[PDB]
Write an enzyme that holds these catalytic residues in place. Structure first.
Site, short mmCIF file in Angstrom:
data_model
loop_
_atom_site.label_atom_id
_atom_site.label_comp_id
_atom_site.label_asym_id
_atom_site.label_seq_id
_atom_site.Cartn_x
_atom_site.Cartn_y
_atom_site.Cartn_z
N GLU A 1 18.96 -82.77 9.14
CA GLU A 1 19.06 -82.00 10.35
C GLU A 1 18.73 -82.77 11.60
O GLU A 1 19.18 -82.42 12.64
CB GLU A 1 18.16 -80.77 10.28
N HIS B 1 23.92 -82.43 10.89
CA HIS B 1 23.92 -81.08 11.27
C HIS B 1 25.29 -80.61 11.66
O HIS B 1 25.93 -81.17 12.49
CB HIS B 1 23.06 -81.06 12.50
N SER C 1 23.51 -73.28 13.85
CA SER C 1 22.86 -73.80 15.04
C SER C 1 22.55 -72.61 15.92
O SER C 1 21.97 -71.63 15.46
CB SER C 1 23.79 -74.78 15.77
P1 LIG Z 1 23.10 -76.32 17.91
C1 LIG Z 1 21.30 -76.52 17.92
O1 LIG Z 1 23.55 -75.83 19.24
O2 LIG Z 1 23.78 -77.71 17.61
C2 LIG Z 1 25.19 -77.75 17.45
C3 LIG Z 1 25.69 -79.13 17.84
C4 LIG Z 1 27.17 -79.31 17.55
C5 LIG Z 1 27.51 -78.97 16.11
C6 LIG Z 1 27.01 -77.59 15.72
C7 LIG Z 1 25.54 -77.41 16.01
#
Ligand SMILES: *[P@](C)(=O)OC1CCCCC1
Ligand SMILES: CC(=O)N[C@@H]1[C@@H](O)[C@H](O)[C@@H](CO)O[C@H]1O
Ligand SMILES: CC(=O)N[C@@H]1[C@@H](O)[C@H](O)[C@@H](CO)O[C@H]1O
Ligand SMILES: *[P@](C)(=O)OC1CCCCC1
EC number: 3.1.1.7
Lengths: 533, 533
Positions: free
Chosen positions: B327, B440, B200
């Site tokens: 995703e 995700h 992420s």
């Molecule tokens: P990233 C786009 O900040 O999303 C996170 C949300 C919680 C789990 C890991 C990824």
């Protein structure tokens, strides 16, 4: 004298011929004058009704082909020559043909009226593939076909002017339809049961009669084969029409008022001279684009075909529409880079991108990129075979399939009963290469029952097929429903939701959904929004 | 006392702790200070190196979590709580952690450096799912993870000002990477073999270190999990960053003239009150959008990530990139109309169309309709199931899959050796509903070998799966090649042409082509052109 071959119409007395068909005799009245010859001062003018005559007019052979460009791309090639004039060229060409059963029907029989295609620049009712003798004998209907002016003679327009208002070729068609209303009963035809049918520009013509109120009262049902009035080639704007007309005038040395003087000078030019410069007035290098086509001027068409379709109440109307399997392939050999009938036309990526601007002319670079995005397989972006089919799909979807699907969808949603087909049989006698599949215009010979001609060499199955198709068309003419009044697979209506159509081939009917729904959503729903911004 | 748990780094002496693992002990030193506490006058400022200390720093427990928003959407729900802070919040949060084999290696071992995700507004190195004890025992590597400032504390930017220059959270990461270079050898780690990996926002962080020269010499390999620096959420414009920073000041009672005065007022505010108003500075209702993210101001990034990616020579670089099967699903329950984890989320087309404006915020109506065109099945335009999956695809492709695909393709085409995966295993322990598929972030627990913890309820096959994933990742860290070097199916490099990637699940490796090539051609090739005109 043979009383069956003698008919009195409002114009006067006619004499016809007795035609031999495999199934029996039919009466044919070929070359009936329905208008004064549009020659000299009458060039570019609306058709005047044929003035009464004394004595007997011999309606015994096809009359002249309206003057038009003659295709020279493949000299001697059957696939191309079949569409070329089979009579002498003349501006004196406003004649129609009537086929009726022998002997004449004693009770009013349904009437089929054919309007040939040819992109509004060519065509004739006399072509062998339009021979109406087989339909009439097999299905006991009356068949009518007419010549209408094409090219500049039929559709050159300086909008607003009375010397060449435009759309006179369509008015030729309308006059012929009025003639049918007034005279078809004398041949045993029913003026209350008249079905229009056409292909290519002919289908677009049929659609324009649907969207023009003075025409709408002259018929009851419609068949649109591989064409629609809302196609990007079937109509042109007033400004662009005027631009092409003055450019043509300029190219031939031309030079009351400005418009009167310009048309007067145009009228002094030999017909062939106009034809020789016809193609030179197109704004860019392209395929599937024609110089002189119907013009949206507020008269014959009060609005664009799109607007009229979307705003129309079509209750009480039955239509039959459809396409061939490969609408785009035919026109690709007329200018798309890397294409020929003589090779497999396995084009490159660069030729594909260049072909898109030709296949989709006069749009923004953004619009062209949108087309490329949609028709590129991004897992195989450079595969020659896939690129060849993609470009065929581009041209076919843009010009035929999606315009037809748009018409079928809106008509069905707004009251009309619609039937849709895809023609998927490739004739055994087809002289075009295999990669072209089932090209545009090749369903016609089966609809007219040409395989029944003993002189020709179609297979027995193809004769069966032809007879089945003639039945569908005639059933629709009689009842507004191609299905027969019983143990066979049925032809469901086309609706905006289910989008059901049938496959026409040697196999029995197979019901399918969506006329290239994903593709036509791009052409009919998104692309217009992109062109506005 | 145990000598293995005693380490001297440049700043002074540390005391670690022995940890238990199903396969033997490991050494851990948790809460090592690598920066001066960014508090008071140091808020919004770049991190300063931790000044040397006398005595022994207790490194036996995780330190405070950086101040951040705490998710309250589903109170008590494991699916969200696992991502919430598990230590007290504090601005005094700049600490890092090192896991090493027990006893400490006496020869240089490859170093893995974890950068947590959390959308730049959340996350912590102390989360259970980031427990490095299993990776380091199984694969005998040294694992480092650091805390970095998030939200306004990490990425509030008044571009051009020295009081709040932006990207200090990224500088926190860089300082930690510099700390690794100077000190990791004292733990047995090899500073000449450092592999960055994150997920992420962590993956986006890794990518930005790739594209920033002062960071580039601090590591040698990179793993990007479900993220990319070129994602539409990962960076923000200078103008928009200034607007957001200004808006936050207003919301908390601060003056807007001077940048100096604005920041000074912000520094007087408790950390919690900044957090309380963070989401409200976003320009519109949205999903997958975060208030304070890295800013492109010509300093940390000298150009947009995409521009830097396109102009870069990436020979000598090996990257491991990939995505999860779904995703888009996770974010949908955070404001997309009709969505919830507690129901099937079978939305209507009206909700789908509304969801598109939420999932693709800040674009023209034309851009939105282009999305709707591509992600509509026009044969089934209103099917609730298909619409749910379609919007998930929209959010997923736009934010993650296609940015990753673009990154992978451009890097590979410009010299880098790229390995791509899609993670398709749904954990038996997953608490999210079945319709969300593999959301995700739920591949992380498998990479960190969490299923090997006996106290957790993973299956026997899932443990073997985790072990195979750890081997892939460690192989890559050691050699730049995930493949065991081998009669098992090989993992081929990703290239712009072949576009090969592998599926990761309980079944053996399966090679496939195209990271959603059709959809990503829209997002990466066409849509930018559309926004330009
Ligand atoms: P990233 C786009 O900040 O999303 C996170 C949300 C919680 C789990 C890991 C990824
Ligand atoms: C076109 C057609 O139908 N016939 C022609 C004709 O010249 C010839 O007699 C026939 C023999 O099968 O083959 C060909
Ligand atoms: C995320 C979302 O749209 N929530 C809706 C809520 O607004 C609506 O009131 C409810 C019942 O109508 O159904 C659900
Ligand atoms: P259209 C655009 O007039 O072209 C075909 C029509 C049917 C006959 C072949 C050409």
């Amino acid at each position: 004298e043979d009383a069956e071959l003698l008919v009195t119409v409002r114009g006067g007395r006619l004499r016809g011929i007795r035609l031999k068909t495999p199934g029996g005799p039919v009466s044919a009245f070929l070359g009936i004058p329905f208008a004064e010859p549009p020659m000299g001062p009458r060039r570019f003018l609306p058709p005047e009704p044929k003035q009464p005559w004394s004595g007997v007019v011999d309606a015994t052979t096809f009359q002249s082909v309206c003057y038009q460009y003659v295709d020279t791309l493949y000299p001697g090639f059957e696939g191309t020559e079949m569409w070329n004039p089979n009579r002498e060229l003349s501006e004196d060409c406003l004649y129609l043909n009537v086929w009726t059963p022998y002997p004449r029907p004693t009770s009013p029989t349904p009437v089929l009226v054919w309007i040939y295609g040819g992109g509004f620049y060519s065509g004739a009712s006399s072509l062998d593939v339009y021979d109406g003798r087989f339909l009439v004998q097999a299905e006991r209907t009356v068949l009518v076909s007419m010549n209408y002016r094409v090219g500049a003679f039929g559709f050159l327009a300086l909008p607003g002017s009375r010397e060449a208002p435009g759309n006179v070729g369509l008015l030729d068609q309308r006059l012929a339809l009025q003639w049918v209303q007034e005279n078809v009963a004398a041949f045993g035809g029913d003026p209350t049961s008249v079905t229009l049918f056409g292909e290519s520009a002919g289908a677009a013509s049929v659609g324009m009669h649907l969207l023009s109120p003075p025409s709408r009262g002259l018929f009851h049902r419609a068949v649109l084969q591989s064409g629609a009035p809302n196609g990007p080639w079937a109509t042109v704007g007033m400004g662009e029409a005027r631009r092409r007309a003055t450019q043509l005038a300029h190219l031939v040395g031309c030079p009351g008022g400005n418009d009167t003087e310009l048309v007067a000078c145009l009228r002094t030019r030999p017909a062939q001279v106009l034809v020789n410069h016809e193609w030179h007035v197109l704004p860019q290098e392209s395929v599937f684009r024609f110089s002189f086509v119907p013009v949206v001027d507020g008269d014959f068409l009060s609005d664009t075909p799109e607007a009229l379709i979307n705003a129309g109440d079509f209750h009480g109307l039955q239509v039959l529409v459809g396409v061939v399997k490969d609408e785009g392939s035919y026109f690709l050999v007329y200018g798309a880079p890397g294409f020929s009938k003589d090779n497999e036309s396995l084009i490159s990526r660069a030729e594909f991108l260049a072909g898109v601007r030709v296949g989709v002319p006069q749009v923004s670079d953004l619009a062209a990129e949108a087309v490329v995005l949609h028709y590129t397989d991004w897992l195989h972006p450079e595969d020659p075979a896939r690129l060849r089919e993609a470009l065929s799909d581009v041209v076919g979807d843009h010009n035929v399939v999606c315009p037809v699907a748009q018409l079928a969808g809106r008509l069905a949603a707004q009251g009309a009963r619609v039937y849709a087909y895809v023609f998927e049989h490739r004739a055994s006698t087809l002289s075009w290469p295999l990669w072209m599949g089932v090209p545009h215009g090749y369903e016609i010979e089966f609809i007219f029952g040409i395989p029944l001609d003993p002189s020709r060499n179609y297979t027995a199955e193809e004769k069966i097929f032809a007879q089945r198709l003639m039945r569908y068309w005639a059933n629709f003419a009689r009842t507004g429903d191609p299905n027969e009044p019983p143990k066979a697979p049925q032809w469901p209506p086309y609706t905006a939701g289910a989008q059901q159509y049938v496959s026409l081939d040697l196999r029995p009917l197979e019901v399918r959904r969506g006329l290239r729904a994903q593709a036509c959503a791009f052409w009919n729903r998104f692309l217009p929004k992109l062109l506005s911004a």
